[PDB]
């Protein structure tokens, strides 16, 4: 057979935009240490207070998302100029990260110890408001739990399954966050939305960037557990209202 004619026939084959974009979404890409190094090195090489920049990139990721070029078209010139600055120095991208790629989501994840304190102040300004989560759970949902990056500080190996309880309590927020950012999931069931995120969210909890003792101190400072490792009432009630949605 003639193989030049075989490859030539690909000119007359479907390059469907819908199917092509579907294949690239599934073959998707994590990396905590290298994100911290790249932000500090590129920030200081441009002579910036990269510490202050990390805070700004975190707050920008919590209120507008992971599409820097898209949010800049719906923002004041005051904010849009700061966005263009941080995109230049840190070479930010729109998602689907690589080995050395920096995204607004990966900054909030690697620098989660500050995200968990900014959640105390931004609960009413998030895509899913803190009062809404206060309505989904029968109590005041822990503000420390209102972003996926919280899973990076969850030690599943904590005694008496509290690490799995915190995870279950965290999942009650995760399902409603995924429904808002993916409109196709708004008609799915609670367990169908759960199966969509429990794989990368799990890899974060099983991550070893932080030790068991770091995550332990982290949860103590923000009020999820105490020095005696006693869960706050808002955690266990949100977890059992999550297990009810999945069970």
């Amino acid at each position, epitope marked *: 057979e003639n193989y030049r004619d075989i490859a030539l026939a690909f000119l007359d084959e479907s390059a469907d935009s819908g199917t092509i974009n579907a294949w690239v979404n599934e073959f998707a890409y994590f990396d905590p240490k290298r994100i911290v190094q790249l932000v500090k090195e590129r920030g200081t090489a441009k002579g910036r207070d990269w510490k202050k920049d990390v805070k700004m990139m975190i707050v920008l990721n919590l209120v507008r998302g992971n599409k820097p070029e898209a949010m800049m078209k719906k923002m004041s010139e005051k904010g849009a100029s700061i966005v263009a600055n941080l995109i230049s120095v840190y070479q930010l991208k729109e998602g689907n990260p690589g080995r050395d790629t920096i995204t607004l989501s990966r900054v909030s994840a690697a620098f989660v110890p500050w995200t968990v304190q900014a959640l105390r102040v931004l609960s009413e300004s998030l895509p899913v408001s803190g009062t809404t989560m206060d309505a989904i759970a029968g109590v005041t949902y822990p503000r420390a739990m209102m972003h996926p990056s919280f899973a990076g500080i969850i030690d599943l190996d904590l005694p008496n*399954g509290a690490g799995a309880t915190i995870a*279950d309590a965290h999942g009650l927020f995760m399902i409603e966050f995924s429904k808002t950012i993916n409109p196709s999931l708004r008609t799915k069931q609670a367990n169908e939305v*759960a199966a969509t995120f429990e794989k990368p969210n799990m890899a974060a909890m099983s991550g070893r960037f932080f030790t068991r003792e770091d995550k332990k101190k982290l949860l103590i400072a923000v009020g999820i557990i105490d020095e005696d490792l006693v869960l706050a009432s808002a955690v266990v009630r949100s977890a059992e209202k999550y*297990r009810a949605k999945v*069970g």
Partner: nanobody
Amino acid sequence: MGQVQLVESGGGSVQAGGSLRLSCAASGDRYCMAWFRQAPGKEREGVAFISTANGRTDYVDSVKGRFTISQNSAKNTVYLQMNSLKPEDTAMYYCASRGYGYLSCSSYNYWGQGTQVTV
């Protein structure tokens, strides 16, 4: 040598309409415990499971009501009470403890050697 080791017991030959109790001793570790069975020639299928906190328990549709899964948190053992056995229940029964908290019905991790029942 494994972090988790499972040993099932209680399998035997029982006439149709009888009942036997399977027990599984755990060693090394909080998890959702599931009983699976595989008849000769057929594929291994799920029978029962219970949640980590013991609040939720679920059985496959073929054996629902007839089978009863339970656990003694003190002795760290899982039981499978099987009543009204049928010839189709003839299979080797295994125990599992996959994943962790979030879902409830994982599929296919630590396994035991299994035990055979014949009806």
